[PDB]
Design a protein around this ligand. Structure first.
Ligand code: CO
Ligand code: CO
Length: 466
């Protein structure tokens, strides 16, 4: 059976879509340790979001599956009989899932604790991590997009996917000839609007563009939206996620009948403060639960927040330098051979990252007998599953194949880089595989990857659901 599986993967990898590409492909029976297939297994390749595999494992080792994150509100002393504080501080400690509703509930606590007036200023404190918002070699042109959100200790997560540091922009058509209506979402009165967008004739071509030009906090909307068109909604990032958090907290406070009389900006708790009075707090869910939106949808911001959180835990330093070493050391402590690894970030956005397919599989084996193996496993996309929180980035891949419902695997695509790595359980042993593609010249070789995963599922003794 093994001899023929090698022939089959050989033929699959002979696909025209892999022209000029290097492909690291490694397959291991995780019970025996038997290497079933290996090709360029020790070759160093960009992993794209397969890099999140290393990050997730290290966060579970360093922080633990029980770990949660806090946000709190702090005045120098409690409110008076008059119900007055001076300056107020919103303080974030790396919560990657902090919502607008979470800010409202803390605003309700500030009120219920007897504040009616903030006489001084409101500060957003994100000093728990450094203020290095983006990695060195990330591309400025990617910066308006949610996957390239700025990294902060204090960031507002949008929606049930928990997309951090962004706002939802909605563009609605009006009468033909009238400007389109732009709704900045949460960033209303925070980000600036530059609306050059017109409403086009009914049935005209849609040419609408929503940008944030580099080094500005301005949403620039150009082009035409047809009068008959459906509204356009787009997640766009903001400059200084903490400042937007501070902004939304200001409104949250005011909405809960707390008057803020001064300004909103960045600032850390003075330390001059003998014993700061905590007027509100919030605790995230635990890391094991947070791992699901993180890994299923491949959240870049979560990953980089987890790295800085690892840096804080191992070193007291919310820093890429500190957190990345912490990743490496945790993986080493896990029994992983990190020789072939180059860690430049936690998400895999960086083109400075290198893995090898042998390293990936090594980790997949080591993660399988870790105490946290089940929380880790549950976080991965499941091939062909309809439910977005189950199937994730694999929800519309491998449906009606032997892989559907069985293959748990992490994805990762950029220009010239694609990857699929994970597990294949079955009647004939549980397998770990890594498929890493670099240097191909068109569309990501996703069908080739599906083909391999599918064959392995068949080999593991599975059949397509009908
Ligand atoms: Co506003
Ligand atoms: Co099956």
């Amino acid at each position: 059976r093994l001899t023929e599986l090698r022939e089959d993967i050989d033929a699959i990898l002979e696909d025209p879509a892999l022209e000029g590409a290097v492909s690291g492909v490694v397959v291991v029976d995780t019970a025996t340790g038997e290497e079933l297939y290996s090709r360029d297994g020790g070759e160093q390749l960009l992993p794209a979001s397969n890099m999140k595999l290393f990050t997730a494992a290290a966060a579970l080792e360093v922080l633990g599956a029980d770990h949660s994150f806090g946000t709190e509100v702090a005045a120098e002393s409690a409110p008076g009989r008059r119900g007055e504080v001076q300056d107020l501080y919103l303080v974030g400690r790396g919560d990657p899932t902090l919502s607008a509703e979470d800010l409202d509930a803390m605003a309700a606590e500030v009120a219920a604790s007897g504040v009616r007036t903030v006489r001084g200023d409101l500060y957003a404190d994100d000093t728990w991590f450094d203020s290095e918002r983006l990695v060195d070699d990330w591309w400025p042109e990617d910066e308006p997009y949610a996957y390239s959100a700025q990294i902060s200790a204090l960031t507002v997560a949008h929606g049930e996917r928990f997309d951090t540091g962004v706002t939802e922009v909605s563009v609605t058509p009006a009468a033909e000839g009238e400007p389109a209506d732009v709704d900045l979402g949460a960033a209303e009165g925070y980000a600036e609007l530059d609306n050059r967008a017109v409403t086009g004739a009914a049935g005209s071509a849609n040419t609408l563009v929503i940008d944030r030009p580099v080094g500005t906090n301005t949403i620039a909307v150009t082009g035409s939206l047809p009068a008959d068109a459906a509204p356009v909604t787009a997640l766009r990032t903001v400059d200084e996620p903490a400042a937007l958090a501070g902004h939304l907290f200001e409104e949250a406070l005011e909405s809960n009948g707390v008057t803020v009389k001064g300004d909103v900006g960045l600032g850390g708790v003075p330390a001059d403060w003998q014993d700061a009075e905590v007027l509100a707090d919030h605790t995230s869910a635990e890391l094991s639960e947070i791992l699901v939106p993180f890994m299923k949808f491949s959240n870049n911001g979560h990953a980089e927040m987890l790295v800085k959180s690892i840096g804080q835990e191992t070193a007291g330093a919310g820093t890429w330098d500190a957190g990345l070493v912490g990743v490496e050391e945790a993986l080493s402590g896990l029994g992983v051979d990190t020789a072939g690894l180059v860690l430049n970030d936690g998400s895999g956005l960086s083109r400075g990252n290198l893995v090898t397919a042998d390293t990936v599989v090594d980790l997949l084996g080591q993660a399988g007998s870790a105490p946290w193996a089940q929380t880790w496993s549950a976080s991965l996309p499941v091939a062909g599953e309809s439910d977005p929180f189950v199937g994730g980035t694999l929800a519309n891949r491998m449906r009606g194949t032997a892989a559907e419902g069985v293959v748990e695997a992490k994805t990762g695509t950029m220009s010239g880089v694609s990857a699929l790595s994970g597990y294949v359980p079955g009647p004939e042993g549980e397998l770990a595989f890594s498929i890493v593609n670099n240097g191909h010249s068109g569309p990501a070789p996703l069908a080739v990857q599906d083909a391999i995963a599918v064959r392995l599922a068949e080999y593991a003794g599975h059949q397509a659901p009908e």
